[PDB]
Design a protein around this ligand. Structure first.
Ligand SMILES: CCCCCCCCCCCCCCCCCC(=O)O[C@H](COC(=O)CCCCCCCCCCCCCCC)COP(=O)(O)OCC[N+](C)(C)C
Ligand SMILES: CCCCCCCCCCCCCCCCCC(=O)O[C@H](COC(=O)CCCCCCCCCCCCCCC)COP(=O)(O)OCC[N+](C)(C)C
Ligand SMILES: *[C@@H]1O[C@H](CO)[C@@H](O[C@@H]2O[C@H](CO)[C@@H](O[C@@H]3O[C@H](CO)[C@@H](O)[C@H](O)[C@@H]3O)[C@H](O)[C@H]2NC(C)=O)[C@H](O)[C@H]1NC(C)=O
Ligand code: BEF
Ligand SMILES: [Mg+2]
Lengths: 1158, 362
């Protein structure tokens, strides 16, 4: 929808709306990022809890409490267990959601500067004019980011995030240029030049912008980051003619961006709130039920089916009883009507639903809610996920999906800022075919052969850094860098034609650049480099350190302090870096040696290697062809180390042939041929014969444990797909340095060139992958793929490889078969679409870690979503489910906590349904002996306190504190994560065997006490009688609670004192309760049960044989399992018993660079 | 700093055993549990086999017993004496008619002459057994007033409209005098007049005395309390109208605290067989003799084809003769050894290294 932002100008007659004049009603500039807005917290959250099927069942039990046919004693108090559970689950989900609101309130309170001139898009409840007087109180006052509106002039100062979508009016820089760190919106490590509109470029102060009237006829919000259409229109002054300036995406500050290297940027706010492109790519934070939590409903349904069977058995077996004849209920009960009963087992069906209603237990969802909250509480509380540099622990922001983290198969990592540290360091270079630079970046690809006794080369390179800093210690007035120097090459010595090349290489690095110099406010004698690309910031800083300090700039040219002494260099032309050029040239003026002669010039080309080696000189007599083999050998060595390469090339030009070029350059410059490509072709004529000075290499620095972590995720069976908003060869540099891309690999580039192109080499790489399309076979395979193929797709070809069902299937199949998957230049929508491709078409658990707003869609679309925290407040942190400070914490979060939280809850949920039906089924098995009439075996406090006090905590302290192995061994052995990838620990098959074991042990729990009463009903030592049904239900309950809790104990790896105490007290509260309650006269039939039953030795004789028969068929099967078909974690625990892991420290962290040697 | 607290609880570093089920730890555990339960199973069966019991069903005594002494049909009586296993000397029964009793459905006196060939020890329990009387249906077991058990002069709405346990079909009679032991449980109280002795047939002044004291727990006298109704407020239950032909006088109202047969009846039997103590002798022992039980027949069971009986026993500590606990401690003891046998032999003929069956390093 086309919107027209009016500024400093009343709206036109399309303001018929009163009580508020503007009609379009723009969003408030607020990020929501919260699961529930409070108007619909309570409606949405009750539906979320009642998407669980047992909660539907409990509500039906309450509604069927209101009927008197069922005969329920105090039906209104029977709703108190469901009502408090729905409220305690809602409060926990409100506190969880309020922790998102305090980060919404931080971002919305982040203090931009908003012009104090009246804005005509407000709710109720020659472009600058000089003839107007410069009125008071229009200053750019510090107002709130939430208070930004559509139509609002915002002065964005240096180094702050941009509050909305802003079309630039002006910057502090003359000619109205800007710079933006778009690593929030893209993965672009460089800064983007945004241009102020040439109409409004002369606006400078708040007095200028208050007197300026215009409007913007713009297009709607449309989610595509690389496109904008707007028309700035304004009335000419002293001349009634409406002028037009078109607005596009290089005139727009988008909301992820940070203003960089520019004192201020004034602009109109175009889109706010959810209209902003950063937010059209986002969605509302999804409520994200866990996969175990979703498959609990089919486990719940099986219990309804069992419940329906038993109430159907009891309904038909009771209605068959009521039309019997010779029955004592005709005489002693007053059912003296033999008639009025044909098949009235319909009432006794429904009595049985109330009798057996605890077969689906009320404490299920509140048990798993306490589990998942406390599993979130323990992730937040450990210190190995704490980032001290940010002062930030891992923050679980979704408190219910910690077990999603234990089945994860596909991590859809972002690259820039997620994998990378956003530091660019000049690590290596070549001059004259000689390799300089000592870096220990990626010699740790070799963990196959050589050792980790190479902490020494970190120390060896470090001594060579200091020995170089002492050697280069000539008085250089702005080389304050003893700490910001990141090029340790001890060969700065004079072994010379090589020494003349090493001086001149770094001279070209200090000459050919677009880096600016601003005075630092702290130490104003030290001046810091204001560069667009941090590559060139790293290039100019390393020339600064080795002697060639770029110190300032003149109207004539650059000033380079050349080894302590300054020298002006006269720059003749700058051929600017460009996306299509991929190079940058600089012509300096060489000074004169003979007097009275205008001297020569020097072109210096810097740019990519593959297109500088095309533009070199072949007509030589010197060594210009001798070194081309050596420098190419090193730039191949550099890129396999994952380094950004470059080349420096020169040709010393004569004074007249340059002047013929400089004339033909001024022909294309002075004419209006800038949009024409002649200005590039004039630059092409001088860049043909070039003498190769040599190349550079820059480490795009990863975060600290990034290649070690991804090796642990690959040994875990998880497949890392890098999805990036930046370039292809950039993500290949990160791919090699991460050990993703592996030099022996065959990189399978998709590469559309211009529409069935894409399917054919989807089919062609599908003959070396001997398969066509078949993905139903593919989702049976969860191994990490074997063949060294990396798939690389451009993003724009991925728009076509995700179009229809047929091409999505073969593109998925190839990516599933490749070890490394890199989707470069990918929009936020397509990163999410790749996750939505993989998560739907395969039945897989997907992770999607990322920092930045281009990842927020990907993070919200996956099953977990991880934010990486930084110094700034990040949307990917706010919109995520977990938020770590560094990428390498993902190994401690997935391989330890997730792999625990998966296995904790995959054991707990079958243990829980076991736990309940060992007790609730004796309400059924007593029906055989009361003719299914519906009398309770159990005294009423036992039925409250079984799932509340007797057995509630052992399952709860299994779901929270069980560890199959240690937190170190979870990281030493990442292949233990594969049972959750294969989904081995949570099955409906495993669940059905716990039901069949719960069916069995309740046969033991009822019939072992029945078979001590059945013969003559005297079970007491003094003959006085324990034959009340509640007393038999003390027998049954006590077997139930003890063989519940010891079953829960025996299926708990890691018997700690905390769980083993609360298993024992659980086991001893069932004795303590009935000791206390059945000493009071309010017990009322139960009055001295514990004095009479616990003093009866038959109770203690039933108790130890029935706990044997309950626990023994499962304890046999586990002993037969763990001897003959043991799981991998049963063997890894055996090795841990033997001490294969005791040389590791407590809290051993393999991704930690500062870890001890093991 | 933010920095979560490190104290080995929040770091999940609690001291823990981490148990690993090797065959060196689990196979001796099976043999140890197997050893105890064949011993406990051997010592439960040994003590259980000594439990002597006399069960005589007398529901058919108005019909199948004459005025003379005739041996009871072998369907009715079950005798267990461990010193006499082939013991078949049948009990006798005769029926004195009582035509003034005017009830004719269950009247008269079933005199039952059994002969115990071995003496029962000091506690001698005379239990009555009811078979097929179903005291465990859901309306039956809730039908009493807990106020009136607790000796309270409870009104009509507290005996009838009490929410869990009320006297619902049997709260008050036609003229509105509420039933004092109201409800179905108290109403259907097993009448039969059991004697206060066993008459020693063939011996003079050696009648084995019995007593209805010490019949319930002594502690139910805290809950069963003397009533506070006037005698004007209350009526007997409808099937107690023959015991109290004129309602309740100023003196005939039963103190349910002293009346333990009520208190045993008011504990409804869990299962279809019902065994309730009615007569005990804690003082003396019951010799090897021929004895006689004169049961005043008042409780009809034949119209629901139920049985009605006598269960004369001195139980064990486990209560009664019941082979279950002994057999099933033996079964669990023989099963734990059989699976210590199966798993040890499979560990020899299979069995593995305790270090590398892992699926990763294959
Ligand atoms: C019916 C009306 C009832 C009203 C309320 C009744 C009482 C409710 C319970 C009492 C209030 C409990 C509040 C607990 C808040 C825990 C928040 C927390 O742990 O933070 C979390 C970190 O913890 C986690 O993410 C782990 C999961 C939370 C574990 C604790 C959850 C406690 C609340 C849920 C259960 C309540 C049940 C109550 C039933 C009666 C968010 O991190 P942050 O960076 O936002 O924290 C910043 C902390 N400061 C501000 C200090 C820098
Ligand atoms: C051995 C030591 C034991 C010590 C005693 C422990 C007591 C405290 C236990 C803490 C709570 C742990 C369990 C989670 C909450 C379970 C609540 C629940 O569902 O309780 C119900 C009963 O609830 C009630 O009686 C009243 C409602 C109480 C609700 C309590 C909620 C507790 C929330 C606690 C949050 C913080 C927990 C902290 C970590 C453990 C269980 O019902 P049932 O299935 O047993 O009943 C069947 C009976 N019929 C058939 C008639 C319907
Ligand atoms: C204890 O003894 C009484 C009598 O010896 C047992 O019989 C119950 O006696 C009452 C009244 O004597 C009977 O009620 C009567 O029923 C007839 C026909 O059914 C009716 O016409 C009369 O108006 C009167 O209501 C009742 O039928 C009878 N009950 C049974 C089950 O036979 C009583 O059963 C004995 N047992 C107890 C209290 O457990
Ligand atoms: F700069 Be990002 F989206 F990791
Ligand atoms: Mg990126």
């Amino acid at each position: 929808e086309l919107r027209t932002v009016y500024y400093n100008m009343p709206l036109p007659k399309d303001m018929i709306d009163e009580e508020g004049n503007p009609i379009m009603q723009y969003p408030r500039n607020k990020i929501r990022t919260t699961k529930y807005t409070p108007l619909t917290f309570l409606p949405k959250n009750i539906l979320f809890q009642f998407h669980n099927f047992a909660n539907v069942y409990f509500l039906v039990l309450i509604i069927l409490g209101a009927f008197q046919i069922f005969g329920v004693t105090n039906p209104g108090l029977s709703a108190v267990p469901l009502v408090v559970i729905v409220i305690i689950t809602a409060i926990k989900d409100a506190i969880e959601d309020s922790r998102r609101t305090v980060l919404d309130l931080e971002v919305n309170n982040t203090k931009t500067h908003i012009l104090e001139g009246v804005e005509n898009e407000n709710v109720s409840t020659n472009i600058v004019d000089r003839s107007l007087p410069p009125r008071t109180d229009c200053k750019f006052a510090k107002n709130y980011w939430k208070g930004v509106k559509v139509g609002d002039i915002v002065r964005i100062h240096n180094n702050d995030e941009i509050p909305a979508d802003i079309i630039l009016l002006s910057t502090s820089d003359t000619d109205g240029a800007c710079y933006v760190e778009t690593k929030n919106l893209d993965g672009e490590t460089n800064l983007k030049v945004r241009q102020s509109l040439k109409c409004t470029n002369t606006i400078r102060t708040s007095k200028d912008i208050a007197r300026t009237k215009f409007w913007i006829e713009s297009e709607g919000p449309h989610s595509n980051l690389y496109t904008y259409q707007g028309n700035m229109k304004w009335r000419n002054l002293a001349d009634g003619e409406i002028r037009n300036e078109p607005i596009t995406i290089n005139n727009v500050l988008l909301r992820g961006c940070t203003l960089r290297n520019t004192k201020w940027a004034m602009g109109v706010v175009m889109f706010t709130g959810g209209d902003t492109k950063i937010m059209l790519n986002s969605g509302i934070t999804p409520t994200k039920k866990s996969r175990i939590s979703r498959e609990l409903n089919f486990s719940v349904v099986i219990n309804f089916v069992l419940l329906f069977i038993l109430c159907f058995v009891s309904g038909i077996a009771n209605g068959v009883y009521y039309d019997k004849k010779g029955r004592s209920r005709f005489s002693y009960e007053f059912g003296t009507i033999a008639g009025s009963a044909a098949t009235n087992g319909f009432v006794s069906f429904w009595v049985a639903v109330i009798l057996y209603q605890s077969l689906v237990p009320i404490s299920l969802y509140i048990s798993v809610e306490i589990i998942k909250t406390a599993q979130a509480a323990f992730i937040y509380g450990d210190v190995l996920l704490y980032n001290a540099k940010l002062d930030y622990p891992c923050t679980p922001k979704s408190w219910n999906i910690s077990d999603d983290l234990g089945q994860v198969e596909y991590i859809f990592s972002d690259k820039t800022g997620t994998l990378t540290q956003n530091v660019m360091e000049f690590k290596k270079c070549t001059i004259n075919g000689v390799s300089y630079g000592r870096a220990y970046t990626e010699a740790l690809a070799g963990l196959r052969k050589r050792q980790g006794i190479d902490v020494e080369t970190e120390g060896r390179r470090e001594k060579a850094e200091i020995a170089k800093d002492r050697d280069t210690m000539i008085d250089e007035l702005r080389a304050l860098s003893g700490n910001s120097q990141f090029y340790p090459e001890e060969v700065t010595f004079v072994s010379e034609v090589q020494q003349r090349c090493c001086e001149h290489f770094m001279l070209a690095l200090a000459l050919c650049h677009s880096v600016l110099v601003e005075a630092n406010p702290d130490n104003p004698k030290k001046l810091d480099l204001k560069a667009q690309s941090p590559d060139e910031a790293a290039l100019v800083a390393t020339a600064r350190d080795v002697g060639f300090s770029f110190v300032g700039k003149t109207k004539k040219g650059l000033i380079i302090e050349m080894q302590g002494i300054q020298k002006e260099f006269e720059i003749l032309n700058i051929l600017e870096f460009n996306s299509s050029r991929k190079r940058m040239s600089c012509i300096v003026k060489i000074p004169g040696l003979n007097p009275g002669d205008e001297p020569r010039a020097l072109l210096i080309c810097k740019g990519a290697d593959s297109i500088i080696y095309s533009r070199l000189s072949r007509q030589s007599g010197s060594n210009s062809e001798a070194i081309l083999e050596k420098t190419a050998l090193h730039l191949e060595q550099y890129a396999t180390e994952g380094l950004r390469t470059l080349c420096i090339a020169q040709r010393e030009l004569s004074w007249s042939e340059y002047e013929k070029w400089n004339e033909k350059y001024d022909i294309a410059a002075a004419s209006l041929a800038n949009r024409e490509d002649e200005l590039e072709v004039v630059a092409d004529s001088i860049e043909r014969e070039l003498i190769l000075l040599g190349g550079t290499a820059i480490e795009d620095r990863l975060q600290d444990g990034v290649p070690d972590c991804i090796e642990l995720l690959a040994e875990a069976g998880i497949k890392l797909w890098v999805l990036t908003g930046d370039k292809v060869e950039t993500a290949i540099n990160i791919g090699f340095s991460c050990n993703l891309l592996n030099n022996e690999m065959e990189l399978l580039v998709i590469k559309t060139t211009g529409d069935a192109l894409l399917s054919k080499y989807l089919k062609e790489y599908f003959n070396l992958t001997g398969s066509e399309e078949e993905i139903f076979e593919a989702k049976k395979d969860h191994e990490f793929p074997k063949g060294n193929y990396a798939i690389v797709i451009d993003g724009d070809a991925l728009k076509l490889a995700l179009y229809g069902e047929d091409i999505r299937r073969k593109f998925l199949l190839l990516c599933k078969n490749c070890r490394a998957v890199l989707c470069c230049r990918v929009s936020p929508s397509q990163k999410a679409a790749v996750v939505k491709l993989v998560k739907d078409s395969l039945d897989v658990m997907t992770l999607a870690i990322g920092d930045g707003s281009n990842d927020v869609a990907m993070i919200q679309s996956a099953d977990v979503g991880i934010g990486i925290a930084g110094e700034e407040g990040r949307q990917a942190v706010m919109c995520s489910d977990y938020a770590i400070g560094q990428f390498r914490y993902l190994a401690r979060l997935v391989l330890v906590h997730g792999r625990w939280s998966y296995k904790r809850l995959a054991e707990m949920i079958p243990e829980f349904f076991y736990k309940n039906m060992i007790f609730a089924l004796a309400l059924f098995w007593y029906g055989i002996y009361n003719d299914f009439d519906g009398s309770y075996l159990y005294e009423y406090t036992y039925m409250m306190f079984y799932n509340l006090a007797f057995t509630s905590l052992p399952v709860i302290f299994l779901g929270i504190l069980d560890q199959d192995v240690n937190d170190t061994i979870s990281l030493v052995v990442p292949q233990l994560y594969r049972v959750g990838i294969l989904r081995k620990e949570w099955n409906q098959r495993k669940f059905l065997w716990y039901m069949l074991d719960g069916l069995y042990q309740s046969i033991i729990c009822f019939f072992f006490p029945y078979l001590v009463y059945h013969k003559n009903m005297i079970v007491t030592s003094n003959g006085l009688g324990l034959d009340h049904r509640y007393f038999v239900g003390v027998y049954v309950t006590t077997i139930a609670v003890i063989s519940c809790n010891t079953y829960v104990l025996l299926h708990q790896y890691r018997w700690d004192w905390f769980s083993g105490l609360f298993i024992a007290l659980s086991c001893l509260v069932v004795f303590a309760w009935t000791g206390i309650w059945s000493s009071a006269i309010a017990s009322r039939e139960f009055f001295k049960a514990a004095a009479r039953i616990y003093g009866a030795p038959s109770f203690w004789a039933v108790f130890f044989v029935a706990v044997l028969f309950c626990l023994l068929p499962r304890f046999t099967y586990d002993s037969f399992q763990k001897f003959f078909y043991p799981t991998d974690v049963e063997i890894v625990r055996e090795m841990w018993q033997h001490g294969h892991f005791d040389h590791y420290p407590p809290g051993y962290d393999p991704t930690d660079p500062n870890r001890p040697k093991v | 700093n933010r920095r979560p607290k490190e104290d080995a609880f929040t770091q999940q570093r609690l001291a823990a055993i981490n148990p690993v089920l090797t065959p060196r730890t689990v196979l001796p555990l099976y043999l140890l549990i197997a050893v105890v339960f064949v011993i406990v199973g051997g010592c439960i069966l040994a003590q259980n086999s000594k439990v002597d019991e006399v069960t005589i069903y007398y529901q058919d005594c108005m019909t199948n017993a004459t005025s003379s002494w005739s041996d009871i049909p072998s369907e009715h009586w079950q005798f267990v004496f461990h010193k006499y296993k082939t013991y078949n000397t049948a009990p006798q029964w005769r029926f004195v008619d009582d035509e003034s009793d005017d009830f004719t459905k269950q009247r008269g006196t079933c005199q039952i002459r059994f002969t115990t060939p071995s003496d029962m020890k000091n506690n001698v329990y005379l239990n009555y057994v009811l078979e097929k009387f179903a005291a465990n249906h859901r309306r039956y077991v809730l039908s009493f007033s807990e106020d009136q058990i607790r000796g309270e002069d409870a009104s009509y709405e507290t005996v009838h409209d009490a929410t869990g346990i009320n006297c619902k079909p049997l709260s008050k009679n036609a003229d509105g005098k509420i039933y004092y032991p109201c409800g179905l449980i108290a109403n259907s109280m097993f009448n039969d007049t059991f004697p206060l002795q066993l008459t020693n047939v063939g011996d003079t002044s050696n009648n084995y005395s019995l007593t209805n004291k010490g019949i319930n727990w002594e502690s139910d006298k805290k809950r069963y309390k003397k009533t506070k109704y006037n005698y004007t407020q209350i009526a007997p239950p409808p099937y107690w109208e023959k015991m109290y032909p004129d309602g309740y006088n100023e003196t005939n109202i039963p103190d349910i605290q002293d009346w333990e047969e009520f208190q045993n009846w008011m504990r409804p039997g869990a299962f279809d067989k019902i065994t309730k103590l009615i007569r005990i002798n804690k003082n003396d022992t019951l010799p090897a003799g021929e004895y006689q039980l004169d049961i005043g027949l008042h409780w009809p069971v034949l119209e629901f084809n139920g049985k009605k009986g006598i269960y004369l026993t001195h139980g064990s500590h486990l209560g009664g003769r019941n082979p279950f606990l002994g057999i099933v401690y033996l079964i669990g003891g023989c099963i734990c050894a059989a699976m210590a046998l199966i798993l040890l032999t499979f560990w020899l003929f299979g069995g593995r290294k305790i270090a590398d069956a892992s699926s990763l390093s294959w």
